[PDB]
Amino acid sequence: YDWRADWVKGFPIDSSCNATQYNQLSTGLQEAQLLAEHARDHTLRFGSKSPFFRKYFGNETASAEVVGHFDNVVGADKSSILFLCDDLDDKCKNDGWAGYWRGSNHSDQTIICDLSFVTRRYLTQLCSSGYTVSKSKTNIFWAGDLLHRFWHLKSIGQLVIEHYADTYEEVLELAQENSTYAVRNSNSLIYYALDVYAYDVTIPGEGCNGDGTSYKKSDFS
Amino acid sequence: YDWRADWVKGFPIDSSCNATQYNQLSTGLQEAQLLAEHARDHTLRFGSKSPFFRKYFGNETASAEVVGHFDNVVGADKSSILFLCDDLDDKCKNDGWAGYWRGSNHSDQTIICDLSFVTRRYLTQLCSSGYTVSKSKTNIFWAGDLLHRFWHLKSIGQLVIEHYADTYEEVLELAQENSTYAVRNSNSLIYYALDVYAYDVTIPGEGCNGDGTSYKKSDFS
Amino acid sequence: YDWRADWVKGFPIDSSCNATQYNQLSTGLQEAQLLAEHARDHTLRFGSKSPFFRKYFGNETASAEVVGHFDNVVGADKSSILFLCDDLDDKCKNDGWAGYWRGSNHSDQTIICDLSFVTRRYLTQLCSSGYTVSKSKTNIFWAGDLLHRFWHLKSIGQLVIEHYADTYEEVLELAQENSTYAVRNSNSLIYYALDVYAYDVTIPGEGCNGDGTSYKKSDFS
Amino acid sequence: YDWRADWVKGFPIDSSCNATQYNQLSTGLQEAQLLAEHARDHTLRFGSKSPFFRKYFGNETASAEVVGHFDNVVGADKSSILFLCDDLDDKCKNDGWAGYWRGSNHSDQTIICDLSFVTRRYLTQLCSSGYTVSKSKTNIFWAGDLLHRFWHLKSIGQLVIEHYADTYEEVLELAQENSTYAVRNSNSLIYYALDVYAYDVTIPGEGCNGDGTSYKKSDFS
Amino acid sequence: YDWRADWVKGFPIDSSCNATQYNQLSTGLQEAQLLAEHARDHTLRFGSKSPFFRKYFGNETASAEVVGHFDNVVGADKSSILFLCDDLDDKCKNDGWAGYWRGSNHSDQTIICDLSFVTRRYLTQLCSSGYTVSKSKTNIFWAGDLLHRFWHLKSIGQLVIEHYADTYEEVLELAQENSTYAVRNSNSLIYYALDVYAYDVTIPGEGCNGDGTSYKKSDFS
Amino acid sequence: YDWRADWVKGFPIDSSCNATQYNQLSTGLQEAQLLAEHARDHTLRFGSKSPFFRKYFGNETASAEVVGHFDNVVGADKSSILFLCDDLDDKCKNDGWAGYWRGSNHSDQTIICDLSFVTRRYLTQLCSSGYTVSKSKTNIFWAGDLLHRFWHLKSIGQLVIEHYADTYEEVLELAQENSTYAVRNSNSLIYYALDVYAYDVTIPGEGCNGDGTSYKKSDFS
Ligand SMILES: [Zn+2]
Ligand SMILES: [Zn+2]
Ligand SMILES: [Zn+2]
Ligand SMILES: [Zn+2]
Ligand SMILES: [Zn+2]
Ligand SMILES: [Zn+2]
């Protein structure tokens, strides 16, 4: 049994999407996977010697679960997962909804409404038009919005990633008060990934956190 | 700060070892890293759908820490680890000692005695001369002996992997009774890695566990 | 004298633009070059045997100048060209201006205003949100807007490409009336490139021209 | 319709030629294509900044048609072109005829007589045995002789390349007098290609023009 | 007849060997081929300018047959050679036998006994545990033992390599006295290969000959 | 001492040769090495199983010296060899002299006269214009003319290759009469190389020997 020949590592898309919807959805999925890969590489390189890891997960926390989560996002068998462009449950009618998870009956399926193809942004425009990591919402860009959808699936989240803290202040408090549940909080991982990508790639050496902190090379040792 | 050009992913060796000792220690370390990489790949491909994972870690356990540990072994900054061939603590004189960890004063240093160069075997001789995974000691080969030494280092183990169960039957009981602690047990990881390597590479489809179990393709779904 | 070593094929950007502006300007310039390369490949493969060429340039026109223009855009010495973000001529104050050519005193220089970083789209969103090649403006996307700016530079356009027809109907009439002058017309070239890219890549086999014409494989021979 | 998998970029040869004629004809065609490619690259790098372009095409002529002709020779669909080794019109009986074009009834076919396999040289012998570009005939080598045959075919010449000036002095006059017609003159392109190849590859920095001119690095700026 | 598509340069193994026997036999054969390749490269690089060649083959001997032997080992066609783990002659009961050549009736077949899978060592352990090239037997390692069995095969030895000198002193005397038969002597080639490999790879600059001779870079000129 | 970093495998040329002389001589030197490599590959693939080997070296002759001779030409240190275009010994004045060996005082040097640049042919014209291997002279082409010069050098020939037979009939008699000196005869090797190249590449399956022999696939077994 050569299981290396059936290994699917990309997110499948259903046939309910036409050409133009497919073109943008695939690009968004690729950008989300790229963000996850960069986060995993940063974690492997530094660990708890990084101020970002220290402030999002704890001062003396072990980095194995974070690496495992990001590596599961990057490479794993995505054969039961399907992304659809069809409103089967009749829920896109609500005001301000760009998609939803199908629920427990179909725990590996998710729906994308038409607002996503009008409001979501791409990674080349990060930290522009007044955007900051700590003051704006996390679903403005394709990558941070699809990372949130991934955590709800059964093959990726595995029924351990939940919503323990949502605001930036609550996330900072949970980092230092409860480090056991900080590594499985939904918003902490997204904040960490966005911050490290902005610091390493977009504006090298500065980032765009926007809360009054600046980190140098002496903070990494 | 380009930290991608400052990244060290191999285990350094001190100059106390001459050419002959270096030649064999390097090969042993490479074999240990290869075993860790294959274990990571098997975990990422299957998770809790494979019978080996179910029998060593639990029927419905999440595979994040297991991936993280082997990924830390494969890729991480080994800039503070050192392997020495010099008896700095006068402990190779004991009976049957092939090495020791230097302890809390030097948490990233290991010493190798002369017995290892005459007793340790190589991966091409697996499942031969009457060896079985479950009935023989885990330190007969270089890879399984060095995996156990990796778990004591501060940069790899991070003070969470310990000895909760050592015997095969105790490991089997821990897998089903206390699943939270059977992801940070030293012997469970080594048994899992040795069992999944021999089933996939050494004797494809059969393995050499030698306890009375046979698994087919229908058990992986 | 090895002139293959100091051969610059990309478009230089001045230091007046900060990191955020640079990130988007580079992507726009690369997309324009990619569009020109695809147009060149289509022209070389077919010539006057394709309906797009016949309806934009003439039924029996020779395809040499058309190939040469796109080849000059793709590969040539861009050593005297500079793109700036400073308003050195005090012209961005005008309503609806996204940039301007510096003129005959500085024939290889051009200025980009801030409206560009707010209204320009990317190639992954082509033929969406009601966009139509025949009915919309040619400067909605980054690539079509920068191709028009390329024709004004001294080293690319070489003082032969002008404005002979601007609307779609005028271009269509010029194709059949004056074939000698509809090979150095800016709008003709931009329309041709956008049409062939939309037909070949975005919606394979259909395109998004939106004028009531549909071409099959039998029209290419 | 994937037209990139149906693209033919080499010149086909009929089955009339035996094993020995094919071997030499293929090498001749390859050398002609290589010469065209080098001429295209020199034009793309320099334009009207090189003295060779200035002396063959005009002091301030635009380089788009010149690039397009050589690019058409290098890469284009050669699917209806055929080279034959069989006398079908009974014309090889003439004195000094090494081949001919089949005419308007068969606009994409050429015939090669037996003198070609006796009196044609290779690119490794350029500028030797007293040969000069200005004082010798242009059909002495395979590469310069097949380029002249390419201009007569319908899929490459496209009925725009003609004989307006044959001798070297008339070629030099046409460049300064009528630059509109000295871009579609058969002999100007061949002289240009041979001169730039000899200057760049055969004898770097000197060439073998044999006219009385010596160009330095300061002439290219 | 394209004979490049059916060219076999590896030694085939019969299906009478199970998985564990196959795994070790393949590694041994590969190591033997690697040793032969290194010997060929050393001979080509130096010839009679190296002290090892001088001391094993003669002070003024020509090096063509020595190169040809190792090249035949590395890259001749091996489609009629077979290695078997089946005792078809009842010769395993002889004390101390690890294998035997099948004889003149089957001149291209060899049998491997079970004693070989317990005693033979690997190239990573060369010059260790008190081993010296001059004083130990040549069949201690897989490569040296398997090289001696190739000289008996009809496709490799070709009925010209024999046993003229067996001990080290007789080999050293044959090198200086009878140079015409030193290039056809079985033990001389193995001694030469082991010496050059130990000097070049295992202990760079010193080797492990163990007879009191040390060579520097000035002896190679 | 890393001797793989200063390994020279091409034939050096002196500064006494101008640009055109260098251009022609380097190509001539490369063609001979290509021919030698093909001859070595044919010998390794077949040995005495091919009818070309049997007719030039003997029915049951071993093939190691032939392989070594061609391998020394293909890959070996050539740092003491030099080719010159200056007539230092005053010998480029006799009728029909295209070069000469400098003799025992300078045994690694060769002079090339001016007839070589006028008379020698290239491998693309093999078996044409009435050429046959057995009825024409050996030195008509660059490759066969330079293979004869290689055998006189001290670093390649090594004072064992001589002139024992010159005509085709004598060469054929020597193979069956005296097989020990046929493998070190200058003309036998060149005849064998030319024959196998013409049979394998120039006219696949037929060759151009021109003596009334035809070999099929059944002859190679
Ligand atoms: Zn959620
Ligand atoms: Zn322990
Ligand atoms: Zn304009
Ligand atoms: Zn003509
Ligand atoms: Zn023997
Ligand atoms: Zn001679």
Residue numbers in the entry:
A (entry chain E), B (entry chain F), C (entry chain D), D (entry chain C), E (entry chain A), F (entry chain B): 31 to 251
Give me lines lifted from the publication on this model:
From our cryo-EM structure of Pra1 prepared in the presence of 1 mM ZnSO4, we observe that the cryo-EM map is continuous amongst a cluster of three histidine residues (His 178, His 182 and His 193), which all point towards each other, consistent with the coordination of a metal ion. In this subunit (subunit B), the center of the zinc ion is equidistant to the center of the N3-nitrogen in the imidazole ring of each histidine residue. There is an extension of cryo-EM density in the metal ion binding site, likely indicating the presence of a water molecule to complete the tetrahedral coordination of the zinc ion. Although we generated two final maps for the Pra1:Zn2+ structure, one with c1 (no symmetry) and the other with three-fold c3 symmetry imposed, we analyzed and deposited the c1 map. In the c1 map, we are able to observe that the distances from the center of the zinc ion to the center of the N3-nitrogen in the histidine residue vary by subunit. For instance, in subunit A, the distance from the center of the zinc ion to the center of the N3-nitrogen of His 193 and His 182 is 2.3 Å. In contrast, the distance from the center of the zinc ion to the center of the N3-nitrogen of His 178 is 2.7 Å. These variations may be indicative of differential binding modes and may be important in the molecular mechanism of zinc ion binding by the Pra1 hexamer. In the context of the overall Pra1 architecture, these six Zn2+ binding sites are located on the outer face of the hexameric ring. The lack of metal ion coordination, and the change in pH, does not lead to global conformational changes in the resolved portions of Pra1. Indeed, a structural superposition of the hexamers in the presence and absence of Zn2+, shown in Supplementary Fig. 7, has an RMSD = 0.175 Å.
In response to such conditions of low zinc availability, C. albicans secretes a zinc-scavenging protein called Pra1 to capture zinc from the host. Following extracellular secretion, Pra1 associates with the fungal cell via a cognate receptor called Zrt101; the PRA1 and ZRT101 genes are encoded at the same genetic locus. In this study, we present cryo-EM structures of C. albicans Pra1 in the apo-state as well as in the zinc-bound state at 2.8 Å and 2.5 Å resolution, respectively. The structure reveals a hexameric ring-like assembly in which each subunit is related to its neighbor by a 180° rotation.
